[PDB]
């Protein structure tokens, strides 16, 4: 409709006076109207970094694509928009940030859906994993403060119920899911802000990813790339040492050159 055409353009181009006016007086408007690519007002405002429009839309209840807008904002590193979205009762009241990608794929609430069918990113990619993938240090910190963690993908030869039934079901989603989890674990954004000893964590993770490169021959390049990310993180931390005490901490751990 003309009201929805006008409303979508106002949100997309940051026409705050029009966006605010329509959300107040209009009683015949569907905030969930989509454009030619199936993007509603929230997804258009987040994509163009319209924080003022984003907060006006989120005040309107029955607004859709809340979960996808957070992932879209995290992907673009819009820190101010992220904390505006993370202040939506879909995230604040619930525990969506804390739950694992597996637990997320058991809810089946289509919260992070960007359209009738599908998600913008892989369903296994949680907000914390996406923030780690994009290496958004401030977004990772914000999600870590909320309790978000990356679950380790288990061993390749894991005979637990979850790893057995996921490999039996698809064996390709499971293979791609563990790469995404390790791609977030191996990010310097998550390595530095999660563990008390990132240098020890990166060294151990570098070995773990190197071994998986041989086991998963077809995704060998993916795992070798992630191993190098942990390899040059500890080199990066060593490069920042400025006196002997800092060097002796990185090299000896907590003079045995451990």
């Amino acid at each position: 409709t003309a009201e929805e055409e006008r409303f979508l353009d106002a949100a997309e181009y940051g026409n705050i006076p029009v966006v605010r006016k329509m959300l107040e007086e209009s009683k015949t408007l569907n905030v969930n109207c989509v454009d030619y690519m199936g993007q509603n007002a929230l997804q258009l405002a987040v994509g163009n970094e319209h924080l003022e429009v984003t907060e006006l839309l989120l005040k309107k209840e029955n607004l859709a694509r809340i979960g996808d807008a957070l992932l879209l904002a995290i992907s673009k590193g819009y820190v101010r928009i992220v904390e505006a979205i993370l202040n939506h009762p879909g995230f604040a009241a619930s525990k969506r940030l804390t739950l694992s990608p597996c637990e997320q794929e058991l809810q089946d609430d289509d919260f992070y859906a960007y359209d009738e069918d599908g998600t913008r990113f892989s369903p296994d990619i949680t907000p914390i994993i996406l923030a780690a993938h994009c290496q958004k240090y401030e977004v990772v910190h914000m999600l870590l403060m909320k309790g978000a963690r990356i679950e380790r993908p288990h061993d390749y030869f894991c005979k637990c119920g979850d790893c057995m039934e996921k490999q039996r079901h698809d064996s390709f989603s499971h293979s791609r899911s563990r790469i995404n989890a390790y791609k977030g674990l191996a990010s310097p954004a998550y390595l530095s802000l999660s563990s008390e000893d990132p240098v020890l964590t990166a060294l151990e993770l570098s070995n773990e990813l190197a071994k998986l490169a041989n086991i998963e021959k077809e995704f060998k390049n993916d795992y070798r790339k992630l191993s190098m990310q942990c390899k040059d993180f500890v080199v990066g931390v060593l490069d920042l040492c400025r006196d002997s005490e800092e060097v002796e901490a990185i090299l000896n751990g907590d003079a045995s050159l451990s």
Epitope: A2, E5, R6
Partner: nanobody
């Protein structure tokens, strides 16, 4: 200057059906539309149709119950009104313009240069 004259208006009971006609005299009327003006308020859009037939309807209250159409070749604009409501009582104008632009899909009265006299529609419940 295109000449627009409205016809078909009158008094109908609620839930009834009406059909408004707009006779156009001139060639530069590639964009036409219907606008209503309830008493005590401002003139607002109802529908708008291009020459190729692309239509947009103002709001979602009139969508599905109001239909705009044009003989195009015969230079006539029609507004099929069904399921009339008491709030639909207003003065209905047909407007024409040679060009609108990116603001055409908003059905805004200020984008139309030529206007008819308007016909009064009074829906009684």
């Amino acid at each position: 200057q295109v000449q627009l004259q409205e016809s078909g208006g009158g008094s109908v009971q609620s839930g009834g059906s009406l059909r408004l006609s707009c006779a156009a005299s001139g060639d530069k009327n590639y964009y036409m539309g219907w606008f209503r003006q309830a008493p005590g308020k401002e003139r607002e859009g109802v529908a708008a149709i291009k020459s190729d037939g692309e239509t947009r309807y103002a709001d979602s209250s009139v969508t599905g119950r109001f239909t705009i159409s044009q003989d195009n070749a015969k230079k006539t604009l029609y507004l099929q009104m069904t399921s009339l409501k008491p709030e639909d009582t207003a003065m209905y104008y047909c407007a024409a313009d040679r060009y609108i632009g990116t603001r055409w899909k908003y059905v805004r009265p200020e984008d139309y240069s030529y206007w008819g006299q308007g016909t009064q529609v009074t829906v009684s419940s």
